[PDB]
Amino acid sequence: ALFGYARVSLDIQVRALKDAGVKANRIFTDKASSDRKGLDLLRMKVKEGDVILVKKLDHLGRDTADMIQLIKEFDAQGVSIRFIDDGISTDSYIGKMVVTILSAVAQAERQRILER
Amino acid sequence: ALFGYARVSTSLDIQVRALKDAGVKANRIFTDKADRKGLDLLRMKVKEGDVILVKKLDHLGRDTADMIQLIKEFDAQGVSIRFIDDGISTDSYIGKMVVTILSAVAQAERQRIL
Amino acid sequence: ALFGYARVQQSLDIQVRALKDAGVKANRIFTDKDRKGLDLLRMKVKEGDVILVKKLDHLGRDTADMIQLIKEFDAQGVSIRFIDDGISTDSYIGKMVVTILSAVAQAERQRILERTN
Amino acid sequence: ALFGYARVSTSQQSLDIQVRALKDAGVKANRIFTDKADRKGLDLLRMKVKEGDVILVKKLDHLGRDTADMIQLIKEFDAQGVSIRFIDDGISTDSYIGKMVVTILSAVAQAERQRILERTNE
């Protein structure tokens, strides 16, 4: 089954997931600052063969460590994640490597700006 | 204009079925097991503007360097590659970013050894 | 203070000699064959300390575990230096570089595993 | 030859921390070039460097105003055969790691520009 995840501007993500063909009862959301309600519900409901659509790489984990763990868990469950805006999926080991690289790069930029 | 390539280390029907399901004609699908024979046949048939479909990034080369080399030589003759499961085309700005990230990785691995 | 950590017997003995030759005192070297040595390291280590590791591949069991270990030690004010890779977790760029190289090592491992499995 | 470069937006305090760190890493006082953002010290530096030279910089973030600027400056010096050593990060631009970081960051920056162009074009 096809799922969607969105996190905070949420309507920009939610409408985008719906227009990607995710049904409403399969869209889970978190208002980030229990920042994990929706994601925990998604982690529970997902099963082997399922697909999760995420608008952006940044909307998954709250940092690179968190995102790498989530990808590990979903992959272990036999669930692939596709990032709509980034145009990449976790559906191959090269794919996962690139996603991890991009998260790491995006994390570094946040930290540079935070020090600045 | 639409071609297909499948490769295994050792089955092979999973990739071919995916290529067929993406609209590649059976006579445009070339395969390899374990040595360049099917990839060679594909080289002689493809033309500027054509697109070669592949199931995953994982399936193209023997390793990352080899895959990058293949991408770049098909790119030299105006031929792009679409990786189905990854949802990535080498001729898009994302595909180009990915190939450059992979080239960086492969060069670093090479320099590391030295 | 300078500590050493090695995960894997001969390849563990190569790593230990390498850490000693890198300047780590024998009694500050901790090893694992799952995490008995790491649990001991966690207890001795204090703010401003540095852990030496021969290769990136020898800290965690996978990328998720390694980044988590780094996050944890960083939170204690303990940095990690990888001898072979020539990089430390001191700055956010070092951490970024270490994440990248782990992702690369992991991909290679998965590439090896599939051509075997 | 060994040079140093320090750059700030406005804060004098961090410029002094940078210059001090540069001296402490062994750059001669007459070999430190500075800017208060601009490019005055950088333009002077460019006249003085030659193939083989090394420029110390405190942190990656003290070279350019942003990532895209930093990458362009690294590539400019690199084409001259001049490398940059970032002290706090422990990375040289001419190592396999510095080369990898520069290439990966320029790939990402290039994708973001392509992204803007597509939104502009459509």
Tab-separated table of C-alpha atoms in Angstrom:
chain	number	residue	atom	x	y	z
A	1	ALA	CA	0.000	0.000	0.000
A	2	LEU	CA	0.970	3.616	-0.607
A	3	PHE	CA	1.513	5.886	2.417
A	4	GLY	CA	2.422	9.560	2.839
A	5	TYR	CA	4.337	11.410	5.555
A	6	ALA	CA	4.507	15.191	6.110
A	7	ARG	CA	6.100	17.330	8.833
A	8	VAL	CA	6.485	20.939	9.987
A	9	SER	CA	3.213	24.791	5.588
A	10	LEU	CA	1.826	21.269	6.109
A	11	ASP	CA	-0.925	21.887	3.543
A	12	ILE	CA	1.834	22.371	0.928
A	13	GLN	CA	3.069	18.877	1.829
A	14	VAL	CA	-0.353	17.232	2.376
A	15	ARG	CA	-1.828	18.458	-0.932
A	16	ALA	CA	1.386	17.393	-2.681
A	17	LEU	CA	1.045	13.882	-1.218
A	18	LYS	CA	-2.636	13.680	-2.220
A	19	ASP	CA	-1.777	14.815	-5.771
A	20	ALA	CA	0.838	12.059	-5.792
A	21	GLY	CA	-2.076	9.650	-5.272
A	22	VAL	CA	-1.942	8.945	-1.522
A	23	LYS	CA	-5.341	8.410	0.097
A	24	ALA	CA	-6.205	10.602	3.108
A	25	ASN	CA	-6.391	7.715	5.615
A	26	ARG	CA	-2.824	6.869	4.581
A	27	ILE	CA	-1.344	10.340	5.146
A	28	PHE	CA	0.323	10.822	8.521
A	29	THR	CA	1.566	14.194	9.793
A	30	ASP	CA	3.627	15.648	12.633
A	31	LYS	CA	3.666	19.238	13.855
A	32	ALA	CA	7.375	19.258	14.745
A	33	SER	CA	8.983	21.566	17.321
A	34	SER	CA	5.115	14.365	21.100
A	35	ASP	CA	6.823	15.412	17.839
A	36	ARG	CA	6.531	11.780	16.732
A	37	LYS	CA	2.803	10.879	16.987
A	38	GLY	CA	2.165	10.574	13.229
A	39	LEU	CA	5.526	8.964	12.460
A	40	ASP	CA	5.036	6.394	15.248
A	41	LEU	CA	1.595	5.532	13.860
A	42	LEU	CA	3.158	5.140	10.397
A	43	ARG	CA	5.997	2.942	11.748
A	44	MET	CA	3.325	0.718	13.375
A	45	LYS	CA	0.992	0.381	10.387
A	46	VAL	CA	3.557	-0.177	7.642
A	47	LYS	CA	4.144	-3.728	6.297
A	48	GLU	CA	6.403	-5.510	3.789
A	49	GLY	CA	5.900	-4.169	0.267
A	50	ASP	CA	4.517	-0.795	1.336
A	51	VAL	CA	5.763	2.534	-0.065
A	52	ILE	CA	6.027	5.855	1.818
A	53	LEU	CA	6.015	9.166	-0.009
A	54	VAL	CA	7.793	12.062	1.718
A	55	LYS	CA	7.813	15.582	0.219
A	56	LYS	CA	11.398	16.361	1.248
A	57	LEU	CA	14.405	14.575	2.717
A	58	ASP	CA	14.362	17.088	5.604
A	59	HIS	CA	10.807	16.119	6.665
A	60	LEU	CA	11.713	12.569	7.761
A	61	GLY	CA	14.060	12.520	10.784
A	62	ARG	CA	14.736	15.575	12.945
A	63	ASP	CA	18.442	15.074	12.151
A	64	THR	CA	20.757	12.829	10.092
A	65	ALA	CA	21.170	10.305	12.947
A	66	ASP	CA	17.361	10.103	13.273
A	67	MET	CA	16.875	9.786	9.514
A	68	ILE	CA	19.483	6.997	9.132
A	69	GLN	CA	17.768	4.994	11.904
A	70	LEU	CA	14.320	5.454	10.272
A	71	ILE	CA	15.605	4.305	6.904
A	72	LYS	CA	17.182	1.264	8.640
A	73	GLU	CA	13.838	0.417	10.256
A	74	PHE	CA	11.720	0.873	7.144
A	75	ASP	CA	14.207	-1.101	5.025
A	76	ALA	CA	14.146	-3.883	7.672
A	77	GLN	CA	10.356	-3.969	7.341
A	78	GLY	CA	10.702	-4.167	3.517
A	79	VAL	CA	9.363	-0.651	3.027
A	80	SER	CA	10.812	1.809	0.488
A	81	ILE	CA	10.713	5.590	0.869
A	82	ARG	CA	10.483	7.955	-2.081
A	83	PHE	CA	11.301	11.658	-1.684
A	84	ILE	CA	9.059	13.588	-4.078
A	85	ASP	CA	10.970	16.878	-4.225
A	86	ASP	CA	14.443	15.344	-3.995
A	87	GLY	CA	13.518	12.832	-6.739
A	88	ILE	CA	15.255	9.883	-5.039
A	89	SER	CA	14.121	6.668	-3.281
A	90	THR	CA	15.653	4.319	-0.693
A	91	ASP	CA	14.847	1.380	-2.994
A	92	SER	CA	18.493	0.346	-3.680
A	93	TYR	CA	21.743	0.312	-1.699
A	94	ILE	CA	23.253	3.032	-3.942
A	95	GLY	CA	19.982	4.977	-3.428
A	96	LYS	CA	20.263	4.745	0.357
A	97	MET	CA	23.910	5.820	0.216
A	98	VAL	CA	23.056	8.970	-1.754
A	99	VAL	CA	20.130	9.784	0.596
A	100	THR	CA	22.474	9.468	3.601
A	101	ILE	CA	25.102	11.641	1.848
A	102	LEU	CA	22.464	14.325	1.112
A	103	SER	CA	21.116	14.285	4.694
A	104	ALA	CA	24.682	14.683	6.011
A	105	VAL	CA	25.283	17.630	3.664
A	106	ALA	CA	21.947	19.255	4.616
A	107	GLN	CA	22.727	18.736	8.325
A	108	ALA	CA	26.106	20.470	7.933
A	109	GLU	CA	24.470	23.515	6.301
A	110	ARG	CA	22.003	23.890	9.186
A	111	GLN	CA	24.906	23.768	11.648
A	112	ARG	CA	26.940	26.313	9.641
A	113	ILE	CA	23.973	28.714	9.690
A	114	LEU	CA	23.451	28.065	13.426
A	115	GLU	CA	27.069	28.967	14.195
A	116	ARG	CA	26.760	32.018	11.910
B	1	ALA	CA	14.416	5.044	-28.467
B	2	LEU	CA	13.534	3.011	-25.369
B	3	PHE	CA	16.004	0.206	-24.520
B	4	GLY	CA	16.538	-2.014	-21.474
B	5	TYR	CA	19.489	-3.508	-19.612
B	6	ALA	CA	19.551	-6.147	-16.886
B	7	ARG	CA	22.492	-7.641	-15.002
B	8	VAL	CA	23.006	-10.173	-12.214
B	9	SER	CA	26.053	-11.443	-10.343
B	10	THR	CA	24.555	-14.965	-10.463
B	11	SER	CA	17.484	-14.285	-10.677
B	12	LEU	CA	17.296	-12.218	-13.897
B	13	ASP	CA	13.547	-12.487	-14.646
B	14	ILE	CA	12.684	-9.921	-11.922
B	15	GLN	CA	14.594	-7.159	-13.730
B	16	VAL	CA	13.402	-8.173	-17.222
B	17	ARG	CA	9.768	-8.267	-16.076
B	18	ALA	CA	10.201	-4.714	-14.682
B	19	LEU	CA	11.681	-3.475	-17.983
B	20	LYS	CA	8.833	-5.065	-19.940
B	21	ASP	CA	6.329	-3.438	-17.529
B	22	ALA	CA	7.913	-0.020	-18.198
B	23	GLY	CA	7.267	-0.389	-21.946
B	24	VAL	CA	10.574	-1.695	-23.251
B	25	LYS	CA	10.052	-4.068	-26.192
B	26	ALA	CA	11.389	-7.602	-25.629
B	27	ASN	CA	13.829	-7.270	-28.560
B	28	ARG	CA	15.329	-4.119	-26.994
B	29	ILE	CA	16.210	-5.857	-23.697
B	30	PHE	CA	19.828	-7.006	-23.282
B	31	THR	CA	21.146	-8.956	-20.314
B	32	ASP	CA	24.354	-9.992	-18.543
B	33	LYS	CA	25.272	-12.684	-16.004
B	34	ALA	CA	28.322	-13.109	-13.709
B	35	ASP	CA	30.700	-10.669	-18.753
B	36	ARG	CA	29.920	-7.741	-21.115
B	37	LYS	CA	28.170	-9.775	-23.895
B	38	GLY	CA	24.707	-8.167	-23.631
B	39	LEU	CA	26.078	-4.684	-22.875
B	40	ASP	CA	28.198	-4.899	-26.048
B	41	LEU	CA	25.141	-5.725	-28.179
B	42	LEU	CA	23.299	-2.759	-26.635
B	43	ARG	CA	26.193	-0.408	-27.493
B	44	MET	CA	25.877	-1.061	-31.238
B	45	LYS	CA	22.116	-0.484	-31.342
B	46	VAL	CA	21.582	2.642	-29.237
B	47	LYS	CA	21.575	6.147	-30.817
B	48	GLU	CA	21.611	9.857	-29.828
B	49	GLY	CA	18.439	10.698	-27.867
B	50	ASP	CA	17.705	7.094	-26.828
B	51	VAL	CA	17.027	6.066	-23.227
B	52	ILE	CA	18.205	2.815	-21.600
B	53	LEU	CA	16.023	1.585	-18.715
B	54	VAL	CA	17.578	-0.248	-15.731
B	55	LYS	CA	15.779	-1.610	-12.668
B	56	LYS	CA	18.087	-0.198	-9.944
B	57	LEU	CA	21.358	1.758	-9.722
B	58	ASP	CA	22.689	-1.466	-8.143
B	59	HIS	CA	22.278	-3.354	-11.441
B	60	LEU	CA	24.410	-1.365	-13.930
B	61	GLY	CA	28.132	-1.948	-13.286
B	62	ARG	CA	30.352	-4.452	-11.490
B	63	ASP	CA	31.006	-1.636	-9.007
B	64	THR	CA	30.427	2.118	-8.602
B	65	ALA	CA	33.394	3.158	-10.801
B	66	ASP	CA	32.280	0.823	-13.614
B	67	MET	CA	28.683	2.107	-13.459
B	68	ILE	CA	29.878	5.743	-13.608
B	69	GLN	CA	32.131	4.915	-16.565
B	70	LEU	CA	29.167	3.345	-18.407
B	71	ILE	CA	26.860	6.300	-17.677
B	72	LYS	CA	29.510	8.751	-18.901
B	73	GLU	CA	30.217	6.933	-22.188
B	74	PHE	CA	26.528	6.608	-23.069
B	75	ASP	CA	26.213	10.282	-22.074
B	76	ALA	CA	29.033	11.091	-24.537
B	77	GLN	CA	26.870	9.734	-27.369
B	78	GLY	CA	23.702	11.492	-26.138
B	79	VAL	CA	22.205	8.374	-24.569
B	80	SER	CA	20.690	8.613	-21.090
B	81	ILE	CA	19.847	5.950	-18.509
B	82	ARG	CA	16.670	5.664	-16.449
B	83	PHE	CA	16.839	3.726	-13.173
B	84	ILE	CA	13.249	2.584	-12.581
B	85	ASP	CA	13.120	1.759	-8.834
B	86	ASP	CA	15.278	4.740	-7.883
B	87	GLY	CA	13.130	6.976	-10.078
B	88	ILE	CA	16.227	8.673	-11.488
B	89	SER	CA	17.221	9.691	-15.034
B	90	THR	CA	20.874	10.546	-15.713
B	91	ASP	CA	19.842	13.485	-17.930
B	92	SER	CA	17.873	15.353	-15.238
B	93	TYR	CA	19.483	17.840	-12.844
B	94	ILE	CA	18.961	15.365	-9.982
B	95	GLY	CA	20.441	12.521	-12.051
B	96	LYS	CA	23.436	14.727	-12.858
B	97	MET	CA	23.863	15.584	-9.167
B	98	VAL	CA	23.726	11.887	-8.285
B	99	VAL	CA	26.321	10.914	-10.954
B	100	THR	CA	28.639	13.679	-9.695
B	101	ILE	CA	28.192	12.531	-6.074
B	102	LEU	CA	28.963	8.952	-7.170
B	103	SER	CA	32.035	10.095	-9.174
B	104	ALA	CA	33.308	11.884	-6.055
B	105	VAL	CA	32.786	8.746	-3.966
B	106	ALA	CA	34.583	6.538	-6.516
B	107	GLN	CA	37.523	8.934	-6.907
B	108	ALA	CA	37.892	9.105	-3.108
B	109	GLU	CA	37.893	5.277	-2.888
B	110	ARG	CA	40.598	5.231	-5.582
B	111	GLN	CA	42.790	7.897	-3.911
B	112	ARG	CA	42.296	6.187	-0.528
B	113	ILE	CA	43.887	2.957	-1.834
B	114	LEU	CA	46.943	4.882	-3.094
C	1	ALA	CA	43.401	11.864	27.561
C	2	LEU	CA	43.807	9.569	24.562
C	3	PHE	CA	41.843	6.302	24.368
C	4	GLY	CA	41.609	3.523	21.779
C	5	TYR	CA	38.752	1.352	20.575
C	6	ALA	CA	38.852	-1.718	18.336
C	7	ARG	CA	36.057	-3.978	17.061
C	8	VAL	CA	36.292	-7.139	14.939
C	9	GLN	CA	41.356	-12.391	16.670
C	10	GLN	CA	44.502	-11.620	14.624
C	11	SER	CA	42.765	-8.619	13.010
C	12	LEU	CA	42.001	-7.393	16.538
C	13	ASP	CA	45.677	-7.854	17.470
C	14	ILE	CA	46.727	-5.835	14.399
C	15	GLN	CA	44.324	-3.061	15.459
C	16	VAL	CA	45.585	-3.063	19.072
C	17	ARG	CA	49.264	-2.864	18.045
C	18	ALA	CA	48.280	-0.075	15.630
C	19	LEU	CA	46.619	1.891	18.475
C	20	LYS	CA	49.653	1.356	20.734
C	21	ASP	CA	51.954	2.510	17.912
C	22	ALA	CA	49.641	5.526	17.493
C	23	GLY	CA	50.451	6.447	21.102
C	24	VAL	CA	47.534	4.969	23.061
C	25	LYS	CA	48.539	3.437	26.390
C	26	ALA	CA	47.659	-0.273	26.669
C	27	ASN	CA	45.342	0.322	29.642
C	28	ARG	CA	43.313	2.871	27.652
C	29	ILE	CA	42.635	0.441	24.776
C	30	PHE	CA	39.210	-1.226	24.791
C	31	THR	CA	38.103	-4.003	22.437
C	32	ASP	CA	35.054	-5.985	21.340
C	33	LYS	CA	34.798	-9.270	19.423
C	34	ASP	CA	29.198	-7.351	21.420
C	35	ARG	CA	29.801	-4.132	23.358
C	36	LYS	CA	31.502	-5.144	26.641
C	37	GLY	CA	34.607	-3.121	25.706
C	38	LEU	CA	32.502	-0.156	24.577
C	39	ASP	CA	30.558	-0.127	27.860
C	40	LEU	CA	33.896	0.068	29.709
C	41	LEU	CA	35.153	2.843	27.405
C	42	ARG	CA	31.919	4.795	28.081
C	43	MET	CA	32.685	4.759	31.796
C	44	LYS	CA	36.351	5.821	31.650
C	45	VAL	CA	35.879	8.542	29.044
C	46	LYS	CA	35.432	12.180	30.160
C	47	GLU	CA	34.947	15.636	28.629
C	48	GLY	CA	37.824	16.655	26.350
C	49	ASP	CA	39.008	13.067	25.824
C	50	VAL	CA	39.742	11.603	22.380
C	51	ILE	CA	39.104	8.035	21.188
C	52	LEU	CA	41.373	6.652	18.455
C	53	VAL	CA	39.960	4.061	16.030
C	54	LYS	CA	42.048	2.468	13.253
C	55	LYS	CA	39.325	2.408	10.574
C	56	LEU	CA	35.835	3.905	10.268
C	57	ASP	CA	34.523	0.335	9.769
C	58	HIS	CA	35.481	-0.632	13.350
C	59	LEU	CA	33.310	1.686	15.465
C	60	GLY	CA	29.714	0.502	14.966
C	61	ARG	CA	28.042	-2.517	13.366
C	62	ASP	CA	26.454	-0.258	10.714
C	63	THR	CA	25.992	3.419	9.771
C	64	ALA	CA	22.965	3.966	12.034
C	65	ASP	CA	24.848	2.625	15.060
C	66	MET	CA	28.042	4.574	14.273
C	67	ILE	CA	26.318	7.967	13.888
C	68	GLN	CA	24.461	7.306	17.139
C	69	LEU	CA	27.747	6.453	18.908
C	70	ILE	CA	29.300	9.653	17.545
C	71	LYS	CA	26.257	11.714	18.595
C	72	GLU	CA	26.512	10.210	22.099
C	73	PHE	CA	30.262	10.756	22.604
C	74	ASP	CA	29.980	14.251	21.087
C	75	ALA	CA	27.309	15.028	23.707
C	76	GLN	CA	29.863	14.043	26.372
C	77	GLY	CA	32.483	16.336	24.797
C	78	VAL	CA	34.429	13.304	23.594
C	79	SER	CA	35.690	13.277	20.007
C	80	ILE	CA	36.718	10.341	17.844
C	81	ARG	CA	39.687	10.240	15.500
C	82	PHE	CA	39.938	7.743	12.652
C	83	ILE	CA	43.607	6.993	11.947
C	84	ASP	CA	43.386	5.362	8.495
C	85	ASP	CA	40.695	7.665	7.074
C	86	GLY	CA	42.513	10.780	8.366
C	87	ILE	CA	39.506	12.542	9.899
C	88	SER	CA	38.086	13.375	13.361
C	89	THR	CA	34.568	14.135	14.669
C	90	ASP	CA	35.769	17.457	16.186
C	91	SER	CA	33.828	19.788	13.906
C	92	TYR	CA	30.480	19.447	12.148
C	93	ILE	CA	32.402	19.051	8.857
C	94	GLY	CA	34.382	16.135	10.321
C	95	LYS	CA	31.084	14.553	11.391
C	96	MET	CA	29.670	15.142	7.896
C	97	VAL	CA	32.722	13.542	6.267
C	98	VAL	CA	32.510	10.555	8.659
C	99	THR	CA	28.807	10.075	7.840
C	100	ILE	CA	29.636	10.136	4.098
C	101	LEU	CA	32.486	7.585	4.304
C	102	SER	CA	30.371	5.247	6.480
C	103	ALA	CA	27.531	5.409	3.929
C	104	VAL	CA	30.112	4.490	1.239
C	105	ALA	CA	31.600	1.611	3.263
C	106	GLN	CA	28.072	0.353	4.004
C	107	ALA	CA	27.086	0.393	0.315
C	108	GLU	CA	30.191	-1.648	-0.555
C	109	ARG	CA	29.319	-4.177	2.186
C	110	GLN	CA	25.784	-4.509	0.787
C	111	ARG	CA	27.237	-4.880	-2.732
C	112	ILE	CA	29.520	-7.695	-1.497
C	113	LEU	CA	26.632	-9.341	0.403
C	114	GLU	CA	24.253	-9.508	-2.585
C	115	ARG	CA	26.816	-11.050	-4.969
C	116	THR	CA	27.309	-13.710	-2.254
C	117	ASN	CA	23.645	-14.153	-1.219
D	1	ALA	CA	55.025	29.160	1.328
D	2	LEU	CA	52.507	29.428	4.180
D	3	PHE	CA	49.774	32.063	4.233
D	4	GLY	CA	46.714	32.759	6.346
D	5	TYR	CA	43.328	34.233	5.557
D	6	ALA	CA	40.657	35.547	7.917
D	7	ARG	CA	37.240	36.977	7.057
D	8	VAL	CA	34.277	38.396	8.993
D	9	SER	CA	30.942	40.039	8.137
D	10	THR	CA	31.182	42.719	10.842
D	11	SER	CA	32.416	41.207	14.129
D	12	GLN	CA	35.968	42.403	14.872
D	13	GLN	CA	36.124	39.991	17.826
D	14	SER	CA	36.142	36.860	15.642
D	15	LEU	CA	38.683	38.390	13.228
D	16	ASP	CA	41.113	38.744	16.148
D	17	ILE	CA	40.371	35.134	17.205
D	18	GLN	CA	41.094	34.034	13.618
D	19	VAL	CA	44.320	36.045	13.256
D	20	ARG	CA	45.468	34.781	16.656
D	21	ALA	CA	44.675	31.167	15.680
D	22	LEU	CA	46.513	31.652	12.367
D	23	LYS	CA	49.645	32.924	14.157
D	24	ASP	CA	49.379	30.035	16.633
D	25	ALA	CA	49.291	27.573	13.735
D	26	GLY	CA	52.547	29.153	12.476
D	27	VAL	CA	51.593	31.725	9.838
D	28	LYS	CA	53.875	34.792	9.911
D	29	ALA	CA	52.091	38.048	10.771
D	30	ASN	CA	52.967	39.562	7.356
D	31	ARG	CA	51.423	36.542	5.637
D	32	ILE	CA	47.956	36.952	7.146
D	33	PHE	CA	45.385	38.646	4.924
D	34	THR	CA	42.002	39.745	6.267
D	35	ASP	CA	38.639	41.116	5.144
D	36	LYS	CA	35.698	42.847	6.841
D	37	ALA	CA	32.643	42.182	4.658
D	38	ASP	CA	35.294	43.316	1.077
D	39	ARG	CA	37.764	41.146	-0.910
D	40	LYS	CA	40.580	43.681	-0.258
D	41	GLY	CA	42.764	41.208	1.687
D	42	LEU	CA	41.780	38.334	-0.588
D	43	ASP	CA	42.809	40.260	-3.708
D	44	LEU	CA	46.181	41.023	-2.097
D	45	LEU	CA	46.588	37.352	-1.122
D	46	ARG	CA	46.010	36.188	-4.721
D	47	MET	CA	48.985	38.285	-5.905
D	48	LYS	CA	51.321	36.592	-3.445
D	49	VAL	CA	50.517	32.875	-3.723
D	50	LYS	CA	52.055	30.451	-6.215
D	51	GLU	CA	51.896	26.758	-7.093
D	52	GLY	CA	52.627	24.660	-4.010
D	53	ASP	CA	51.594	27.334	-1.480
D	54	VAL	CA	49.240	26.624	1.438
D	55	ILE	CA	46.672	29.007	2.936
D	56	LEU	CA	45.470	28.342	6.483
D	57	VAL	CA	41.899	29.292	7.338
D	58	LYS	CA	40.344	28.862	10.817
D	59	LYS	CA	37.043	27.272	9.721
D	60	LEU	CA	35.405	26.444	6.377
D	61	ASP	CA	32.861	29.185	7.176
D	62	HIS	CA	35.528	31.929	7.312
D	63	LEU	CA	36.532	31.647	3.634
D	64	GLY	CA	33.462	32.810	1.688
D	65	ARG	CA	30.205	34.570	2.517
D	66	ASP	CA	28.334	31.352	1.672
D	67	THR	CA	28.994	27.758	0.512
D	68	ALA	CA	28.809	28.657	-3.204
D	69	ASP	CA	31.386	31.406	-2.708
D	70	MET	CA	33.677	29.114	-0.702
D	71	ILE	CA	33.563	26.441	-3.429
D	72	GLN	CA	34.416	28.963	-6.158
D	73	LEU	CA	37.366	30.338	-4.143
D	74	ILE	CA	38.675	26.820	-3.422
D	75	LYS	CA	38.463	25.952	-7.130
D	76	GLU	CA	40.195	29.211	-8.120
D	77	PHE	CA	43.158	28.610	-5.779
D	78	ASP	CA	43.232	24.906	-6.710
D	79	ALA	CA	43.665	25.817	-10.387
D	80	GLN	CA	46.708	27.878	-9.326
D	81	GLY	CA	48.099	24.846	-7.467
D	82	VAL	CA	47.336	26.516	-4.132
D	83	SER	CA	45.673	24.500	-1.366
D	84	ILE	CA	43.671	25.552	1.685
D	85	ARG	CA	43.996	24.013	5.142
D	86	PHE	CA	41.032	24.442	7.435
D	87	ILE	CA	42.487	24.336	10.965
D	88	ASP	CA	39.446	23.518	13.130
D	89	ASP	CA	38.068	20.960	10.666
D	90	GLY	CA	41.447	19.285	10.020
D	91	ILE	CA	40.907	19.109	6.256
D	92	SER	CA	43.069	20.123	3.300
D	93	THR	CA	41.512	20.892	-0.099
D	94	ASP	CA	44.190	18.805	-1.853
D	95	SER	CA	43.575	15.555	0.084
D	96	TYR	CA	41.190	12.850	-1.134
D	97	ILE	CA	38.720	14.067	1.538
D	98	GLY	CA	38.870	17.789	0.709
D	99	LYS	CA	38.457	16.948	-3.005
D	100	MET	CA	35.452	14.731	-2.217
D	101	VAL	CA	33.796	17.363	-0.009
D	102	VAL	CA	34.285	20.120	-2.611
D	103	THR	CA	32.881	17.932	-5.424
D	104	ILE	CA	29.856	16.756	-3.403
D	105	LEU	CA	29.041	20.301	-2.207
D	106	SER	CA	29.368	21.786	-5.707
D	107	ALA	CA	27.083	19.012	-7.051
D	108	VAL	CA	24.446	19.912	-4.468
D	109	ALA	CA	24.807	23.672	-5.045
D	110	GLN	CA	24.552	23.068	-8.804
D	111	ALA	CA	21.319	21.077	-8.341
D	112	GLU	CA	19.705	23.902	-6.298
D	113	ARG	CA	20.462	26.401	-9.087
D	114	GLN	CA	18.991	24.010	-11.680
D	115	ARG	CA	15.986	23.749	-9.353
D	116	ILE	CA	15.505	27.547	-9.346
D	117	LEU	CA	15.862	27.720	-13.159
D	118	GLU	CA	13.106	25.135	-13.678
D	119	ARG	CA	10.725	27.153	-11.467
D	120	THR	CA	11.774	30.289	-13.374
D	121	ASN	CA	11.363	28.612	-16.796
D	122	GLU	CA	7.885	27.228	-16.009
